[PDB]
Amino acid sequence: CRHFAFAEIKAATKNFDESRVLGVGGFGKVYRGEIDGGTTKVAIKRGNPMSEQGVHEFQTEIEMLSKLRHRHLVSLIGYCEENCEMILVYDYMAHGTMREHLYKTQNPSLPWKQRLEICIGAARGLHYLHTGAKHTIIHRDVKTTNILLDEKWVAKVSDFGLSKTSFGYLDPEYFRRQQLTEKSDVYSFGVVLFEALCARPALNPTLAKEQVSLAEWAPYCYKKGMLDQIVDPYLKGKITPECFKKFAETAMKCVLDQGIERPSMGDVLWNLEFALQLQE
Numbered sequence: 001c002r003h004f005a006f007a008e009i010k011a012a013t014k015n016f017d018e019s020r021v022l023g024v025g026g027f028g029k030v031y032r033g034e035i036d037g038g039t040t041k042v043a044i045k046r047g048n049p050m051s052e053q054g055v056h057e058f059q060t061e062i063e064m065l066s067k068l069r070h071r072h073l074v075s076l077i078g079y080c081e082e083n084c085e086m087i088l089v090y091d092y093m094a095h096g097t098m099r100e101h102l103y104k105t106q107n108p109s110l111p112w113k114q115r116l117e118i119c120i121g122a123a124r125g126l127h128y129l130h131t132g133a134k135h136t137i138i139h140r141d142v143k144t145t146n147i148l149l150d151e152k153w154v155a156k157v158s159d160f161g162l163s164k165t166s167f168g169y170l171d172p173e174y175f176r177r178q179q180l181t182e183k184s185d186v187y188s189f190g191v192v193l194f195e196a197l198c199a200r201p202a203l204n205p206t207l208a209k210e211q212v213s214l215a216e217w218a219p220y221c222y223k224k225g226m227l228d229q230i231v232d233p234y235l236k237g238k239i240t241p242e243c244f245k246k247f248a249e250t251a252m253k254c255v256l257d258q259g260i261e262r263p264s265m266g267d268v269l270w271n272l273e274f275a276l277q278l279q280e
């Protein structure tokens with residue numbers, strides 16, 4: 001893992017110019033930059049060292065990512081804690097979050113096959129977290145803003161601040177059984193799947209009661225045989241019946257009330273790849 005002088009971080013971000021701000025997370029602000037004389041594009045996150053929350057997420061992010069390498073996880077390039085700073089340096093994800101291509105956006109809507117391929121990519125990254133590291137990594141904040149898209153639309157999981165060995169995505173079983181299970185990622189990922197299909201927030205607190213939480217509303221509509229009616233209008237008629245059925249049954253299994261009933265990410269990944277094949 002690389003360490004950057006605080007001067008190199010200023011050079012990368014044209015001295016934290018707000019032209020280069022991409023957004024602000026609860027850790028701090030994120031800047032687009034370039035290092036190595038402009039060959040490598042980067043996203044740079046500045047935390048606040050006097051936030052106890054921030055410092056915990058900072059070391060968690062560095063402890064995790066410095067040992068992981070996977071096509072569908074955002075790579076951490078390096079970091080800077082010089083001058084009592086908290087700076088993280090990642091690969092730039094040129095197409096932003098999955099969420100900003102699903103709704104509340106002026107970006108074009110995504111073809112079904114690319115939506116499916118984005119969800120397979122994320123499922124591969126999550127599968128690697130659960131089976132490819134020394135111990136299972138529980139991401140704990142899987143959501144559509146934490147799936148980033150690079151210049152070639154490769155889906156990548158990000159935001160490892162709450163990782164251990166958001167409303168609407170929270171495993172309801174946590175508030176009841178109180179354990180740490182990777183099945184809590186499966187639950188959140190199932191909500192992500194329903195988001196890709198229906199193109200609406202996982203939690204819309206303005207709706208009728210049954211519809212507030214996508215995780216409950218979409219299973220309910222599928223049982224009633226009306227899931228077709230809350231599908232993204234851009235997707236109407238674009239999904240074959242066998243892909244629709246396989247995709248929806250896979251999402252449904254992920255948001256079961258009990259984590260032990262839920263499939264593994266391996267099983268989920270295989271069923272999405274099966275769905276993609278049934279789409280052709």
Ligand SMILES: Nc1ncnc2c1ncn2[C@@H]1O[C@H](COP(=O)(O)OP(=O)(O)O)[C@@H](O)[C@H]1O
Nearest residue numbers: 022023024025030043090091092093094096097
């Ligand atoms: N690694 C990254 N590469 C590219 N853009 C990123 C990266 N991390 C965050 N962003 C940008 O930030 C936004 C989504 O994440 P954001 O909420 O801003 O930061 P965080 O992920 O820390 O909460 C998008 O506009 C996205 O382009």
